[PDB]
Protein backbone atom coordinates (compact mmCIF):
# COMPACT_ATOMS: atom_id res chain seq x y z
CA UNK A 1 0.00 0.00 0.00
CA UNK A 2 1.19 3.51 -1.04
CA UNK A 3 0.14 4.78 2.47
CA UNK A 4 2.00 1.97 4.27
CA UNK A 5 4.90 4.31 5.27
CA UNK A 6 2.66 7.13 6.67
CA UNK A 7 1.64 7.29 10.38
CA UNK A 8 -2.08 6.51 11.06
CA UNK A 9 -2.46 9.92 12.82
CA UNK A 10 -0.90 11.73 9.77
CA UNK A 11 -3.29 9.87 7.36
CA UNK A 12 -6.30 11.03 9.47
CA UNK A 13 -4.97 14.64 9.72
CA UNK A 14 -4.46 14.66 5.89
CA UNK A 15 -7.95 13.16 5.24
CA UNK A 16 -9.36 16.19 7.23
CA UNK A 17 -7.20 18.63 5.15
CA UNK A 18 -8.26 16.94 1.85
CA UNK A 19 -11.91 17.33 2.93
CA UNK A 20 -11.33 21.12 3.49
CA UNK A 21 -9.63 21.29 0.02
CA UNK A 22 -12.53 19.28 -1.61
CA UNK A 23 -9.86 16.71 -2.66
CA UNK A 24 -12.10 13.65 -2.15
CA UNK A 25 -9.94 11.18 -4.16
CA UNK A 26 -7.02 12.10 -1.85
CA UNK A 27 -9.35 11.96 1.22
CA UNK A 28 -10.42 8.36 0.23
CA UNK A 29 -6.80 7.21 -0.41
CA UNK A 30 -5.76 8.59 3.04
CA UNK A 31 -8.72 6.88 4.80
CA UNK A 32 -8.03 3.55 2.92
CA UNK A 33 -4.45 3.84 4.27
CA UNK A 34 -5.80 4.56 7.79
CA UNK A 35 -8.12 1.49 7.60
CA UNK A 36 -5.23 -0.79 6.41
CA UNK A 37 -3.32 0.10 9.66
CA UNK A 38 -5.66 -2.61 11.08
CA UNK A 39 -6.96 -0.61 14.10
CA UNK A 40 -10.76 -0.20 14.54
CA UNK A 41 -12.03 3.30 13.47
CA UNK A 42 -13.49 5.90 15.86
CA UNK A 43 -16.91 7.42 15.05
CA UNK A 44 -15.21 10.48 13.47
CA UNK A 45 -12.86 8.22 11.42
CA UNK A 46 -15.83 6.08 10.13
CA UNK A 47 -17.54 9.33 9.03
CA UNK A 48 -14.31 10.51 7.23
CA UNK A 49 -14.13 7.12 5.40
CA UNK A 50 -17.83 7.33 4.39
CA UNK A 51 -17.72 11.03 3.29
CA UNK A 52 -14.56 10.44 1.18
CA UNK A 53 -15.88 7.47 -0.82
CA UNK A 54 -19.45 8.86 -1.06
CA UNK A 55 -18.00 11.96 -2.77
CA UNK A 56 -15.78 9.93 -5.13
CA UNK A 57 -18.55 7.43 -6.12
CA UNK A 58 -21.04 10.35 -6.32
CA UNK A 59 -19.06 12.00 -9.16
CA UNK A 60 -18.78 8.58 -10.93
CA UNK A 61 -22.59 7.87 -10.58
CA UNK A 62 -23.40 11.35 -11.96
CA UNK A 63 -20.99 10.86 -14.96
CA UNK A 64 -22.33 7.29 -15.56
CA UNK A 65 -26.00 8.52 -15.73
CA UNK A 66 -25.02 11.29 -18.23
CA UNK A 67 -23.21 8.76 -20.48
CA UNK A 68 -25.95 6.09 -20.10
CA UNK A 69 -28.58 8.69 -21.16
CA UNK A 70 -26.52 9.65 -24.27
CA UNK A 71 -25.94 5.94 -25.10
CA UNK A 72 -29.75 5.27 -24.86
CA UNK A 73 -30.56 8.32 -27.13
CA UNK A 74 -27.79 7.07 -29.51
CA UNK A 75 -29.47 3.57 -29.71
CA UNK A 76 -33.03 5.08 -30.26
CA UNK A 77 -24.89 2.88 -34.17
CA UNK A 78 -22.85 6.13 -34.55
CA UNK A 79 -19.75 4.02 -33.56
CA UNK A 80 -18.55 2.38 -30.30
CA UNK A 81 -17.24 5.55 -28.52
CA UNK A 82 -20.26 6.34 -26.22
CA UNK A 83 -20.46 2.66 -25.12
CA UNK A 84 -16.61 2.42 -24.67
CA UNK A 85 -16.51 5.59 -22.53
CA UNK A 86 -19.66 4.59 -20.48
CA UNK A 87 -17.91 1.19 -19.88
CA UNK A 88 -14.67 3.00 -18.77
CA UNK A 89 -16.60 5.12 -16.20
CA UNK A 90 -18.66 2.05 -15.13
CA UNK A 91 -15.47 -0.04 -14.57
CA UNK A 92 -13.92 2.80 -12.48
CA UNK A 93 -17.18 3.07 -10.41
CA UNK A 94 -17.18 -0.73 -9.90
CA UNK A 95 -13.54 -0.61 -8.75
CA UNK A 96 -14.29 2.08 -6.09
CA UNK A 97 -17.28 -0.06 -4.87
CA UNK A 98 -14.97 -3.14 -4.86
CA UNK A 99 -12.32 -1.19 -2.86
CA UNK A 100 -14.91 -0.09 -0.21
CA UNK A 101 -16.47 -3.60 0.06
CA UNK A 102 -12.92 -5.00 0.42
CA UNK A 103 -12.21 -2.68 3.37
CA UNK A 104 -15.54 -3.62 5.03
CA UNK A 105 -14.82 -7.41 4.49
CA UNK A 106 -11.09 -7.05 5.49
CA UNK A 107 -11.72 -6.50 8.36
CA UNK A 108 -13.99 -3.57 9.51
CA UNK A 109 -17.29 -5.53 9.83
CA UNK A 110 -15.84 -8.59 11.56
CA UNK A 111 -14.15 -6.57 14.41
CA UNK A 112 -17.14 -4.14 14.82
CA UNK A 113 -18.95 -5.30 18.00
CA UNK A 114 -20.75 -2.06 19.06
CA UNK A 115 -24.13 -1.34 17.42
CA UNK A 116 -22.95 2.14 16.24
CA UNK A 117 -19.93 0.69 14.36
CA UNK A 118 -21.58 -2.56 13.09
CA UNK A 119 -24.74 -0.81 11.76
CA UNK A 120 -22.61 1.96 10.17
CA UNK A 121 -20.45 -0.61 8.25
CA UNK A 122 -23.42 -2.87 7.26
CA UNK A 123 -25.27 0.24 5.93
CA UNK A 124 -22.13 1.13 3.87
CA UNK A 125 -21.99 -2.51 2.58
CA UNK A 126 -25.66 -2.10 1.49
CA UNK A 127 -24.95 1.30 -0.18
CA UNK A 128 -21.93 0.05 -2.21
CA UNK A 129 -23.86 -3.07 -3.41
CA UNK A 130 -26.70 -0.69 -4.31
CA UNK A 131 -24.24 1.48 -6.39
CA UNK A 132 -23.09 -1.74 -8.10
CA UNK A 133 -26.82 -2.66 -8.70
CA UNK A 134 -27.49 0.75 -10.38
CA UNK A 135 -25.09 -0.26 -13.26
CA UNK A 136 -25.61 -4.10 -13.20
CA UNK A 137 -27.31 -5.79 -16.26
CA UNK A 138 -25.78 -9.34 -16.46
CA UNK A 139 -26.12 -12.79 -14.73
CA UNK A 140 -24.91 -10.94 -11.55
CA UNK A 141 -27.64 -8.25 -11.08
CA UNK A 142 -29.96 -10.54 -8.98
CA UNK A 143 -27.00 -11.65 -6.77
CA UNK A 144 -25.78 -7.99 -6.32
CA UNK A 145 -29.34 -6.87 -5.32
CA UNK A 146 -29.57 -9.76 -2.82
CA UNK A 147 -26.13 -8.78 -1.34
CA UNK A 148 -27.42 -5.18 -0.85
CA UNK A 149 -30.70 -6.45 0.72
CA UNK A 150 -28.84 -8.89 3.04
CA UNK A 151 -26.43 -6.17 4.38
CA UNK A 152 -29.27 -3.61 4.83
CA UNK A 153 -31.46 -6.27 6.58
CA UNK A 154 -28.73 -7.30 9.11
CA UNK A 155 -28.12 -3.54 9.79
CA UNK A 156 -31.89 -2.97 10.29
CA UNK A 157 -32.25 -5.98 12.68
CA UNK A 158 -29.33 -4.72 14.87
CA UNK A 159 -30.56 -1.06 14.74
CA UNK A 160 -34.08 -2.02 15.90
CA UNK A 161 -32.67 -4.10 18.80
CA UNK A 162 -29.87 -1.71 19.92
CA UNK A 163 -30.64 1.93 18.94
CA UNK A 164 -33.49 4.33 19.63
CA UNK A 165 -35.78 5.22 16.74
CA UNK A 166 -34.20 8.76 16.45
CA UNK A 167 -30.58 7.47 16.22
CA UNK A 168 -29.23 9.26 13.08
CA UNK A 169 -27.37 6.09 11.92
CA UNK A 170 -30.63 4.09 12.24
CA UNK A 171 -32.53 6.88 10.38
CA UNK A 172 -29.96 7.12 7.54
CA UNK A 173 -30.03 3.33 7.20
CA UNK A 174 -33.85 3.25 6.91
CA UNK A 175 -33.73 6.16 4.39
CA UNK A 176 -31.22 4.31 2.20
CA UNK A 177 -32.95 0.87 2.53
CA UNK A 178 -36.28 2.53 1.49
CA UNK A 179 -34.65 4.02 -1.66
CA UNK A 180 -33.16 0.52 -2.35
CA UNK A 181 -36.72 -0.89 -2.16
CA UNK A 182 -38.22 1.88 -4.34
CA UNK A 183 -35.78 1.84 -7.29
CA UNK A 184 -33.51 -1.23 -7.06
CA UNK A 185 -35.86 -3.94 -5.75
CA UNK A 186 -38.95 -2.56 -7.65
CA UNK A 187 -40.84 -2.63 -4.28
CA UNK A 188 -42.35 0.89 -4.00
CA UNK A 189 -44.90 -0.27 -1.35
CA UNK A 190 -42.10 -1.62 0.86
CA UNK A 191 -40.20 1.70 0.38
CA UNK A 192 -43.24 3.82 1.36
CA UNK A 193 -44.11 1.59 4.38
CA UNK A 194 -40.52 1.66 5.61
CA UNK A 195 -40.23 5.46 5.19
CA UNK A 196 -43.60 6.11 6.95
CA UNK A 197 -43.02 3.73 9.96
CA UNK A 198 -39.46 5.12 10.35
CA UNK A 199 -40.71 8.77 10.25
CA UNK A 200 -43.61 8.13 12.71
CA UNK A 201 -41.47 6.14 15.24
CA UNK A 202 -38.78 8.87 15.18
CA UNK A 203 -41.45 11.63 15.63
CA UNK A 204 -42.68 9.90 18.83
CA UNK A 205 -39.09 9.71 20.29
CA UNK A 206 -38.06 13.36 19.56
CA UNK A 207 -39.30 14.44 23.04
CA UNK A 208 -36.31 12.46 24.60
CA UNK A 209 -33.62 14.48 22.76
CA UNK A 210 -31.41 17.49 23.53
CA UNK A 211 -31.55 20.44 21.08
CA UNK A 212 -28.37 19.13 19.29
CA UNK A 213 -29.67 15.49 18.96
CA UNK A 214 -33.05 16.92 17.80
CA UNK A 215 -31.35 18.86 14.93
CA UNK A 216 -29.35 15.69 13.89
CA UNK A 217 -32.56 13.48 13.89
CA UNK A 218 -34.94 15.99 12.23
CA UNK A 219 -32.42 16.66 9.39
CA UNK A 220 -32.68 12.95 8.31
CA UNK A 221 -36.45 12.82 9.04
CA UNK A 222 -36.76 15.70 6.50
CA UNK A 223 -35.12 13.43 3.80
CA UNK A 224 -37.71 10.65 4.61
CA UNK A 225 -40.50 13.28 4.26
CA UNK A 226 -39.01 14.56 0.95
CA UNK A 227 -39.06 11.01 -0.53
CA UNK A 228 -42.58 10.27 0.79
CA UNK A 229 -43.78 13.56 -0.86
CA UNK A 230 -42.40 12.29 -4.25
CA UNK A 231 -43.71 8.70 -3.76
CA UNK A 232 -47.37 9.27 -2.47
Amino acid sequence: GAMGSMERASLIQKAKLAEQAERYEDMAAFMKGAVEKGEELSCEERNLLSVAYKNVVGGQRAAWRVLSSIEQKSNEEKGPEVREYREKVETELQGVCDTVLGLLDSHLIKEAGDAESRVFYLKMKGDYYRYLAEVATGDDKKRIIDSARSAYQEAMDISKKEMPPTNPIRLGLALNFSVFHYEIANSPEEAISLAKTTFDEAMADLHTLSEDSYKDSTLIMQLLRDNLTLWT
Binding site: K54, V56, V57, G58, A62, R65, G172, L175, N227
Partner: peptide, 12 residues
Protein backbone atom coordinates in the same frame (compact mmCIF):
# COMPACT_ATOMS: atom_id res chain seq x y z
CA UNK B 1 -33.25 10.84 -13.52
CA UNK B 2 -34.86 12.03 -10.35
CA UNK B 3 -32.47 10.72 -7.72
CA UNK B 4 -34.32 10.21 -4.36
CA UNK B 5 -32.77 11.54 -1.08
CA UNK B 6 -30.20 9.21 0.46
CA UNK B 7 -27.92 9.69 3.45
CA UNK B 8 -24.90 12.04 3.49
CA UNK B 9 -23.18 14.08 0.73
CA UNK B 10 -25.45 14.68 -2.30
CA UNK B 11 -22.28 14.32 -4.44
CA UNK B 12 -24.03 12.95 -7.65
Amino acid sequence: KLMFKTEGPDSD
